[PDB]
């Protein structure tokens, strides 16, 4: 008989108590930053691994001093939903080869909460789902236990917008988009995010609604890199730098803001930007509607690895250069910056596509696990920078690490082998540091630069 | 004698501007405006004549005005000869650049307007190209038929390139609002145009490292808007199947910080008209194409957005069906033309295929745009226009907005329930009702529909 039914009151002297089913990056981000505002958070996740370590620059130097405060502890078990305030599902929700969504850990991580679940309680569904999961998959199997959505417990989906990289920085300032499967959902996840993070709410009428933003915004993503990367292409023929381009271009106010022309790399990996799209696609096609833009896109930055690789020989052989005097040296394994995941990177079809001419390819990044780059590359990495940069008569930045930009190359001109190719994939150098480049001997070459 | 820098340092700024067109008059009157004397040459008599006169045919919103008073100040004048390029500080090229069937651009009114320049230039002059160009146009075709006078260009004289950035509805509200983006053809040419801009007309310049470069930006800018009003419609499609409103939407992803500003999806429409995003894509294209670069993402926007027309009429007869409606029963009124809010031109505008479309299938259709030229209507979609709001509403079954003229915003629907014949389909194409106006609507008893509302 409550005027705020799933949610108590944010002046409360006791904590709020939270629960995260899934601590992936989605899930440890949320945790540290609920947890370092007051909450008391416990991360459950089926790997024994993960729980048994938790009991992205500033998240390992923030999980460890949270743990020590007690307010983040970590459960294999769903036990502790009992005693949780709002219970937020972050689960992996991969598609098959016919992009269709796996609900796999979805269904057995809800088959866990339901007869746990109590009512006034609220949950929050953050994994990406194709539109209606919330409402008629997710729902029902919470509703087993006995209990009804919007009656007697709040059930919202928000999309998670994290930028990897930036995640810690950018999650309390950026405004949360909240879709309620009704109007007491709807209130007591806004009265959420807006007490337990400090940040904006932006409602929409509906978690279908919300689920589509999610996708909307990686269908955009995807196919604004697909216009930058064939601008690139085109730039490159006509020996004009696309930065200076997309730079100029970018000063001209339209829409909602300004036209933002994103930056070209080496293709597109992770899960967000190659899955989320065709997940939109499939939908659209099992519904009669064609998403073509989504066709193109796929197929454009699908084959940026291949182009990638052909640009990269073609540079060398204009020094002098081939498969038979060269080693390309690979600075960067990971699709996101300041991140170490290598799981689907275009990095990989560059380095298959460099090795299946016949060129000798040296991997190193710094912030990958090596046993990661052997069962996603074939071969061990490097043992550091200056193994992978030793006689290198390339040097391939696919990854734009803040790491690789704090490097000294002038002492990397005395380990290379001269002449040597610099070629800058996804570090988009200023053209002050690429003058330093070419001072040191070193000859400079980008996507369309 | 010292090397000469290519623009002065008491005299007003002579200005010669080559096409005396929408851009070239826009550019005139803001140029004279600010204290410059310019002289507007045209090829046809009739525009010069005009201009001469201080009339403009031009809509363009206080352009007509700007005219009458500038060339009764005498810093206005035009002229159908080149003469008076030889006593210019700066030319300024804004002729024609159409392009043919095969995306190819047509370079006739360009090469008459350098051939007739070229003989006139001296040194130290400044030279600007403002038309829409394939890139390279600027150095490989325009400088060399300045130097065939013997003068060569960035030595003698300053060469730049630099886009065309105005908005029709809002040019002359906005010229000075917006950074020019300049690409010399080389040091003494960037430094000559940036100078110019700046003191000419007192905005900000964005300097590109050549001319090829600033002809890049024009085409990538269309590139982009045109392909984004692609993903936008396909979003607005799929949203319909969905049950959900795409506005909300667009609203909700847009909150998010990306690139070099935010998360930007434009808005959808009814399909996408006019010079610039039907023809610099595929003019991008078909140059990649000669050059091996395949614009798969250009060939995508254009065939999504051109399918946009035939599917906005066909969501149109679906809608009223479902009403328990059909082309017997029903007349059609469909208001707004124009492809651009706020703008009268219909030379090429999405709503002639809805229409055509909407005919095709048997409909009676009506068409009315506060402002369009009732001939313009005649000679694109082959029927006169209603002669006011009234005479289009009375009787329709259906009211199509597939412009979202601010003119229509300020209409009173309840006024309008009386006249219509009820049920009534309001289809909101380009209108973009927010949720609120939609059930004042309903409560006149009129049916609302959108794609993706």
């Given at each position: 008989?409550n005027a705020?039914?799933?949610?108590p009151d944010?002046?409360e002297?006791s904590?709020?108590?939270?629960?995260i089913?899934?601590?992936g990056?989605?899930g440890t981000?949320?945790a540290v930053?609920?947890?370092?505002r007051?909450?008391?958070?416990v991360?459950?996740?089926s790997?024994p691994?993960?729980?048994?370590?938790?009991?992205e620059p500033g998240?390992?130097g923030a999980?460890?001093?949270?743990?020590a405060?007690?307010?983040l502890?970590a459960?294999?078990?769903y036990?502790?939903v009992?005693a949780?305030d709002?219970?937020?599902v972050?689960v992996?929700?991969?598609?098959?080869?016919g992009?269709?969504m796996?609900t796999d850990q979805?269904?057995?991580a809800?088959?866990?909460?339901?007869p746990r679940?109590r009512?006034?309680?609220?949950?929050?569904?953050?994994?990406?789902?194709?539109p209606?999961?919330?409402?008629?998959?997710?729902?029902?199997?919470?509703?087993?236990g006995?209990?009804?959505h919007?009656r007697?417990?709040?059930l919202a989906?928000?999309?998670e917008r994290?930028?990897?990289g930036?995640a810690?920085a950018?999650v309390?300032?950026?405004p949360?988009?909240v879709?309620?499967?009704?109007?007491?959902s709807?209130?007591?996840?806004?009265?959420?995010?807006?007490?337990?993070l400090?940040v904006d709410v932006?409602?929409?009428p509906?978690a279908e609604?919300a689920?589509?933003?999610?996708?909307?915004?990686?269908?955009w993503?995807?196919?604004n890199?697909?216009i930058?990367?064939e601008?690139?292409r085109?730039?490159?023929v006509?020996?004009?730098?696309?930065?200076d381009?997309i730079?100029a271009?970018?000063?001209?106010?339209?829409?909602?803001?300004?036209?933002?022309?994103?930056?070209?790399?080496?293709?597109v990996g992770?899960?967000?930007l190659?899955?989320?799209p065709?997940m939109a696609w499939?939908?659209?096609r099992?519904?009669?509607?064609?998403?073509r833009?989504?066709?193109?896109a796929?197929?454009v930055?699908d084959?940026?690895?291949?182009h990638?690789a052909?640009?990269?020989a073609?540079?060398?052989?204009?020094l002098?250069r081939?498969r038979?005097?060269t080693?390309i040296?690979?600075?960067?394994?990971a699709f996101?910056?300041?991140?170490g995941d290598?799981r689907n990177?275009?990095?990989?079809?560059?380095v298959?596509?460099?090795?299946?001419?016949?060129?000798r390819?040296?991997?190193?990044?710094?912030l990958?696990?090596?046993?990661?780059?052997?069962?996603?590359?074939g071969?061990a990495?490097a043992?550091?920078?200056?193994e992978?940069?030793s006689?290198?008569?390339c040097?391939?930045f696919?990854?734009?690490?803040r790491?690789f930009h704090?490097?000294?190359f002038?002492?990397?001109a005395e380990?290379?082998d001269?002449?040597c190719?610099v070629?800058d994939?996804?570090?988009?150098?200023?053209?002050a540091r690429?003058?330093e480049?070419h001072r040191?001997?070193?000859a400079?070459?980008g996507?369309?630069?």
């Amino acid at each position: 008989s409550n005027a705020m039914p799933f949610l108590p009151d944010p002046g409360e002297p006791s904590p709020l108590k939270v629960v995260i089913a899934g601590a992936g990056y989605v899930g440890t981000c949320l945790a540290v930053t609920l947890a370092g505002r007051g909450a008391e958070v416990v991360a459950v996740d089926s790997d024994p691994g993960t729980v048994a370590d938790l009991r992205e620059p500033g998240l390992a130097g923030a999980v460890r001093d949270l743990a020590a405060t007690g307010r983040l502890t970590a459960s294999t078990s769903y036990d502790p939903v009992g005693a949780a305030d709002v219970v937020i599902v972050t689960v992996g929700t991969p598609t098959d080869a016919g992009h269709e969504m796996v609900t796999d850990q979805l269904v057995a991580a809800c088959e866990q909460i339901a007869p746990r679940l109590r009512a006034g309680q609220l949950v929050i569904l953050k994994s990406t789902v194709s539109p209606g999961t919330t409402r008629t998959l997710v729902a029902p199997l919470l509703e087993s236990g006995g209990l009804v959505h919007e009656r007697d417990f709040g059930l919202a989906f928000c999309p998670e917008r994290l930028a990897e990289g930036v995640a810690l920085a950018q999650v309390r300032t950026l405004p949360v988009v909240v879709g309620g499967c009704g109007p007491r959902s709807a209130a007591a996840a806004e009265r959420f995010w807006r007490s337990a993070l400090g940040v904006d709410v932006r409602q929409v009428p509906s978690a279908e609604s919300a689920e589509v933003v999610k996708l909307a915004t990686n269908w955009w993503i995807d196919a604004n890199v697909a216009i930058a990367n064939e601008l690139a292409r085109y730039c490159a023929v006509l020996g004009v730098d696309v930065l200076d381009v997309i730079g100029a271009a970018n000063t001209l106010p339209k829409g909602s803001s300004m036209v933002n022309l994103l930056l070209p790399g080496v293709g597109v990996g992770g899960s967000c930007l190659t899955k989320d799209p065709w997940m939109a696609w499939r939908d659209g096609r099992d519904r009669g509607v064609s998403l073509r833009t989504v066709e193109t896109a796929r197929a454009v930055n699908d084959d940026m690895p291949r182009h990638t690789a052909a640009v990269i020989a073609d540079e060398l052989v204009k020094l002098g250069r081939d498969r038979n005097d060269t080693t390309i040296a690979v600075l960067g394994a990971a699709f996101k910056n300041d991140t170490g995941d290598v799981r689907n990177t275009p990095v990989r079809g560059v380095v298959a596509a460099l090795r299946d001419s016949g060129f000798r390819v040296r991997i190193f990044d710094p912030l990958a696990d090596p046993a990661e780059i052997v069962a996603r590359f074939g071969t061990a990495p490097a043992a550091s920078l200056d193994e992978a940069v030793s006689g290198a008569g390339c040097l391939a930045f696919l990854a734009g690490h803040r790491q690789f930009h704090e490097l000294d190359f002038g002492a990397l001109a005395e380990r290379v082998d001269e002449p040597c190719l610099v070629f800058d994939g996804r570090m988009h150098l200023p053209p002050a540091r690429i003058r330093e480049l070419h001072r040191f001997g070193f000859a400079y070459r980008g996507i369309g630069r």
